[PDB]
């Protein structure tokens, strides 16, 4: 069972110049102190990535999917519970759903049991207790199941001074759905458009299911009452380019530079 939102006061989507995030390991091999050049799907430097800020008011519209999604979230509260991807149409078509709340990471691919809304009630007035665990009602036929160990999702956190910054990248290539993850532990800086630096994206999981995806929406949690918190996340797209990467003595990616971005590049 699920209950709709209504009275949607959608904030204007902000824009942020993504500095250096998005570089990942192209393949599961090892190199050592050698430069490399690779043509690959990427997010370029200095692109106006879309910033969504969530403060009674919920703002999570459905967004079209095109050539992977680079998603980032700086939070502590553990409101995110998964992602809805595909071409759902009240789940009479094929889609996939993700649940990674507390017990395990489960990925289902089905002509789903469906709700009319992402959340459930949503919540009662003061606390954020979870009830009505079924987020899905009735299906025709299902295709694929996957259950694995839960990821590092600390439950509940202070408003402001967020440390849980997690960057995921979603890639689709001919039925290969590759998800790469990287979480950084602490950021003492207050949430702004500031964070820039060096990072690497270790690979996480690959799914050979072979479906069609055209749009996606997030998953965040019978009364209407809540003391508002703070949530900040970013969504951006990708296109094929070629990158020059510098390795190190240990065997990790230190710096990457675009080739078609600038004449100096």
């Amino acid at each position: 069972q699920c209950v709709n939102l209504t009275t949607r006061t959608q904030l204007p989507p902000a824009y942020t110049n993504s500095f250096t995030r998005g570089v990942y390991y192209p393949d599961k091999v090892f190199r050592s102190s050698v430069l490399h050049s690779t043509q690959d799907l990427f997010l370029p430097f200095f692109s106006n990535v879309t910033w969504f800020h969530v403060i009674k008011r919920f703002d999570n519209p459905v967004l079209p999917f095109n050539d992977g999604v680079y998603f980032a979230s700086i939070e502590k509260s553990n409101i995110i519970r998964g992602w809805i991807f595909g071409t759902t149409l009240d789940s009479k078509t094929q889609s996939l759903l993700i649940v990674n709340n507390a017990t395990n990471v489960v990925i289902k691919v089905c002509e789903f049991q469906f709700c009319n809304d992402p959340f459930l009630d949503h919540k009662n007035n003061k606390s954020w207790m979870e009830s009505e665990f079924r987020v899905y009602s009735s299906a025709n036929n299902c295709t694929f199941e996957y259950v694995s160990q839960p990821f590092l999702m600390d439950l509940e956190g202070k408003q402001g001074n967020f440390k849980n910054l997690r960057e995921f990248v979603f890639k689709n290539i001919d039925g290969y759905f590759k998800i790469y993850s990287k979480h950084t532990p602490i950021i003492v800086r207050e949430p702004e458009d500031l964070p820039q630096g060096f990072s690497a994206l270790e690979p996480l999981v690959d799914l050979p299911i072979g479906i069609n995806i055209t749009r996606f929406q997030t998953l965040l949690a019978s009364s209407s009452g809540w003391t508002a918190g703070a949530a900040a996340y970013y969504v951006g797209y990708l296109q094929p380019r070629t990158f020059l990467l510098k390795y190190n003595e240990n065997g990790t990616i230190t710096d990457a530079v675009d080739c078609a971005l600038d004449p100096l590049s």
């Binding site: 599961k28 091999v29 090892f30 190199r31 050592s32 050698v34 270790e202 690979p203 065997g251």
Partner: protein, 49 residues
């Protein structure tokens, strides 16, 4: 003969650190010289004659 890798040389113990997803090791010549034994999980270093 490592999973179809048919080669010849001397095998030493490699002190470098790989990753759980990592399985091989290359060089400028793009030929394999650092490998991982499937049964026992240390790292071997390959050097030609």
């Amino acid at each position: 003969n490592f999973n179809g890798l048919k080669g010849t040389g001397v095998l030493t113990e490699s002190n470098k650190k790989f990753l759980p997803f990592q399985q091989f090791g290359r060089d400028i010549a793009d030929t394999t010289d650092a490998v991982r034994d499937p049964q026992t999980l240390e790292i071997l270093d390959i050097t030609p004659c």
